[PDB]
């Protein structure tokens, strides 16, 4: 009920390999992730997820186009992934 500021978190994709694949890749090396072009992004608070939503840019400033609160159904599957 009582209000307080809190730290949020947005995550752009997750993959699974050793750092040495990218550690060998010096600066300027482009690397892709499971993140592709079009899918929405999730929001975390203090590292705890909330909701799904795309992010756009306005006035040279990013703006999240949030969609809906993440239910435990898809929360479980994204935790599993």
């Amino acid at each position: 009920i009582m209000d307080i500021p809190v730290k949020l978190t947005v995550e752009l994709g997750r993959t699974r390999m050793t750092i040495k694949e990218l550690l060998r890749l010096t600066q300027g090396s482009v690397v892709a992730l499971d993140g592709l072009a079009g899918e929405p992004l999730d929001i975390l608070i203090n590292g705890y997820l909330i909701a799904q939503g795309e992010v756009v840019v306005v006035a040279d400033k990013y703006g999240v186009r949030i969609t809906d609160i993440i239910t435990p159904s898809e929360r479980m599957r994204r935790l599993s992934r």
């Binding site: 009582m2 307080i4 500021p5 809190v6 608070i45 203090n46 590292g47 705890y48 997820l49 909330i50 909701a51 306005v58 006035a59 809906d68 609160i69 993440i70």
Partner: protein, 281 residues
């Protein structure tokens, strides 16, 4: 010294939809489809707007209850000439220019029809988001007589429009004091939001259901003593600093206190015994 800056989102869309409404209104009024080009929203002092205003031109006062103050609209002599000749069906390929000459009774009446049509259009467009009644007050010839703002340097917001009908063109402006929208300064910045249905609040409640799953780091404070950095420099490890009696412990997260508590010795650990949540209400 007078400075204001901001960025706006919603009134752009509001002006666009009002422009479409005004375009269809003029189309049905003059049996000819017009075209309205909305210029970039202008933020400038009142004196700058008056200087940029092409004299002669007609200015009109439209009050906006319950917000104190009156809104202003302007229309070019070219626009009124073209509109009136189209009302007469004139081609307009032999136009005339009048400067300094005040509008005749018939010309002022045609201006009255444009004024009422624009008032209705902006009324519906604005009430589509926020219900704020618009009521005409008094037309004016010279901008200095309008004297709406307290100071000429008072920064005002103006919305320019470029209106054409075929070959015939024109431009009129809608200028508003920034104090007119100062109470709604936060709202105009925010882009328009849809829904607001009953499922929108429980959607906010759904967000709250997500919110209960949150991580919070508390901060415990015992002594906040004011000293001098000279004393700090002469301080050496092993030095002792006396502290008054900490009758209670304030607990805050990132600064904001939430409760008061009492320290205690529990299971060989520094434990605190909360008293009550801090409720500022």
């Amino acid at each position: 010294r007078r400075v204001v800056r901001e960025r706006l989102q919603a009134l752009e869309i509001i002006n666009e939809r009002f422009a479409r409404q005004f375009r269809m209104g003029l189309f049905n009024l003059l049996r000819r489809s017009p075209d309205i080009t909305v210029g970039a929203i202008r933020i400038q002092p009142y004196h700058e707007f008056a200087r940029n205003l092409p004299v002669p031109t007609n200015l009109n006062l439209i009050h906006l209850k319950p917000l104190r103050g009156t809104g202003l609209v302007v229309f070019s002599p070219s626009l009124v000439f073209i509109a009136v000749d189209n009302l007469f069906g004139g081609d307009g390929r032999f136009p005339t220019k009048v400067e300094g000459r005040e509008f005749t009774h018939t010309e002022q009446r045609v201006i009255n029809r444009m004024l009422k049509l624009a008032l209705e259009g902006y009324s519906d467009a604005w009430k589509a988001i926020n219900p704020l009644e618009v009521e005409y007050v008094r037309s004016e010839m010279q901008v200095k007589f309008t004297n709406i703002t307290t100071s000429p340097n008072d920064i005002v917001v103006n919305t320019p429009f470029h209106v054409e009908i075929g070959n015939l063109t024109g431009e009129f402006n809608i200028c508003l004091p920034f104090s007119m929208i100062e109470p709604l300064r936060e709202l105009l910045v925010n882009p328009p939001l849809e829904n607001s249905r009953h499922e929108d609040q429980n959607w906010r409640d759904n967000l709250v259901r997500q919110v209960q799953h949150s991580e919070l780091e508390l901060v415990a404070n015992f002594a906040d003593i004011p000293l001098r950095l000279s004393q700090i420099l002469k301080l050496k490890p092993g030095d002792v600093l006396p502290i008054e009696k900490p009758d209670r412990i304030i607990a805050h997260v990132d600064g904001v206190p939430v409760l008061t508590s009492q320290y205690g010795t529990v299971n060989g650990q520094y434990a605190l015994r909360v008293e009550h949540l801090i409720n500022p209400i």
